[PDB]
Structure 1
Amino acid sequence: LYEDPPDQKTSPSGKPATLKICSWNVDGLRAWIKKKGLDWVKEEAPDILCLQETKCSENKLPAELQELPGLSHQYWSAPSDKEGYSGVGLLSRQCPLKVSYGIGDEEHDQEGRVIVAEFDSFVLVTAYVPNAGRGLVRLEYRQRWDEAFRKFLKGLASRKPLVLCGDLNVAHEEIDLRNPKGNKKNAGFTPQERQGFGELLQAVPLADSFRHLYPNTPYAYTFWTYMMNARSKNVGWRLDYFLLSHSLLPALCDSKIRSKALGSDHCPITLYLAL
């Protein structure tokens, strides 16, 4: 019930996109690689690929990653303990000026959720935000993560324009999920998570790239539960975002949701910037 519009590869002024970023919760790097995930990446050919839920230790990465074309600068962060949980990755054509891990808060830097890669004209963060859990059991912690993450990004943005991407584990508004009424007390659509997302946009400040370009467009989602084949019925949530510093809006070409690409229960999202 949703058709992503064609790629707009020029900026409002007509500048051709110079930077293509793809972000994807892969629900297990090895399982996704098996489902030809890297085949799809090679076709999409991003300058930067950010992955979440790698569930892979930094020293047990598959050999297929060594192969990737112009994505040879690769950065990985996983829980410094048990494997098979969380984990993020950032693979870049160009070498970043600097790469950092976590958000500068030890309690929040233990589950391999955040990679920071600074470039010439912007800083890129990819995040796997902690979900609030069955029965909202981790909601109190998620609210604390939210505030610490906001403070951290506020600091980054004060020095360089910011691009935040990944699985932020909240559907911001009713338009961002198929069933708002039934999910107001479930992880991803609590008033607390939605309020924290609003604070993040106002405080840093950041713009929701997709919603900025497509403010009235419903049924655009990036996650569908595997069960009941929700994906075929498009019973989904928009959990994956590109949020941009306001100063980057003139560089924005497009923000895509690759609804058709398989290999996970999230689909990829793709950003085009003219820097």
Structure 2
Amino acid sequence: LYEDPPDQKTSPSGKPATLKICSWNVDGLRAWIKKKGLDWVKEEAPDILCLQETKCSENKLPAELQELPGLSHQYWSAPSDKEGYSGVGLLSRQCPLKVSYGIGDEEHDQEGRVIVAEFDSFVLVTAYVPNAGRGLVRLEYRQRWDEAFRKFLKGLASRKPLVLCGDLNVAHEEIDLRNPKGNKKNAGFTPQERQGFGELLQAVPLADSFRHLYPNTPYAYTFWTYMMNARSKNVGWRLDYFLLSHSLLPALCDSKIRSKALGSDHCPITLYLAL
């Protein structure tokens, strides 16, 4: 049983939130639209909306999307017929200084997984990290991914404060999933993936915004398998994060998990900063 606390919209020093970022693995744009994903997003009214697993291989974006109120600057993984392609999206009220795609490493840049948007005061990265796979078939690949990604982000953070959000496909600690003992050998909770996530936090460095604010809170999940009504039982995993440069912690007001928002097998997460 989990109840997200009310939105806290001031920083530790009392500054009003000035930026609201929403991130959501949508499990396919079209299916998500059908399930009222966009109605929810219009209620949330974020300054920036980051979407993962759009499954938008085809050139044509749905019309509902370009028309989304306020969020007129929209960046999508380039459409691709490549097998294994996932697609991410980054939509913004303000025009970014600069937008980039991928992580400068060809092995990891074929599947539309990463968008970088630079603003004046910080850089925003959204990512859909590769799942380690059924029977751990993509585990060795995931370890090469974690290292390249860590290095790429360490590079960005050296220029400007960093915000990374998205589906990072790992539950960090035992408190991060309902069933830690049964999943030691499943994608998302292997020691390798937990270790990669620990090295990410250290090397960049980055802080886990939710767990920073709520260090003891259990049953706070962000994903539930469609299988066997896991969501009804809250049999879930926290795979979605906002990770912040330490220098942004004094700007951090709250980090939310939108437990009841329907539309996908993940729920949205939301970040408030005072910048």
Q: TM-score, normalized by length of structure 2?
A: 0.98
The answer as to whether partners of 1:58 and 1:78 remain within 8 angstroms in 2 is: no
For the residues of structure 1 that align with 2:258 and 2:125, how far apart are their CA atoms? 20
Q: Secondary structure at the match of 1:231?
A: coil
For the residues of structure 1 that align with 2:260 and 2:24, how far apart are their CA atoms? 13
The answer as to whether partners of 1:71 and 1:93 remain within 8 angstroms in 2 is: yes
Q: Secondary structure at the match of 2:231?
A: helix
Aligned-pair CA distance for 1:86:
1.0
Q: Secondary structure at the match of 1:51?
A: strand
For the residues of structure 1 that align with 2:189 and 2:79, how far apart are their CA atoms? 26
Q: Secondary structure at the match of 2:70?
A: coil
For the residues of structure 2 that align with 1:79 and 1:70, how far apart are their CA atoms? 24
Aligned-pair CA distance for 1:147:
0.1
Q: TM-score, normalized by length of structure 1?
A: 0.98
Residue 193 (structure 2) pairs with residue 193 (structure 1):
yes
Q: Secondary structure at the match of 2:247?
A: helix
Counterpart in 2 of 1:8? 8
For the residues of structure 2 that align with 1:79 and 1:189, how far apart are their CA atoms? 31
Q: State how many pairs are aligned.
A: 275
For the residues of structure 1 that align with 2:236 and 2:179, how far apart are their CA atoms? 8
Q: Secondary structure at the match of 1:232?
A: coil
For the residues of structure 2 that align with 1:26 and 1:111, how far apart are their CA atoms? 16
Question: CA offsets per residue over residues 112-161 of structure 1, 9 Å max, x none?
Answer: 00000000100000000000000000000000000000000000000000
The answer as to whether partners of 1:131 and 1:138 remain within 8 angstroms in 2 is: yes
Deviates more, 1:207-216 or 1:56-65: 56-65
Counterpart in 1 of 2:87? 87
| Change in CA separation of 1:109 and 1:228 when aligned onto 2, cut-off 3 Å | same
**Contiguous gaps of at least 5 residues in structure 2:** none
Q: Secondary structure at the match of 1:30?
A: helix
Which stretches of structure 1, 4 residues or more, deviate above 4 A after TM superposition? none
| Change in CA separation of 1:58 and 1:123 when aligned onto 2, cut-off 3 Å | farther
**Contiguous gaps of at least 5 residues in structure 1:** none
Q: Secondary structure at the match of 1:40?
A: helix
For the residues of structure 2 that align with 1:36 and 1:245, how far apart are their CA atoms? 33
Aligned-pair CA distance for 1:83:
6.9
| Change in CA separation of 1:7 and 1:16 when aligned onto 2, cut-off 3 Å | same
The answer as to whether partners of 2:58 and 2:80 remain within 8 angstroms in 1 is: no
Counterpart in 2 of 1:125? 125
Deviates more, 1:60-69 or 1:248-257: 60-69
Counterpart in 2 of 1:20? 20
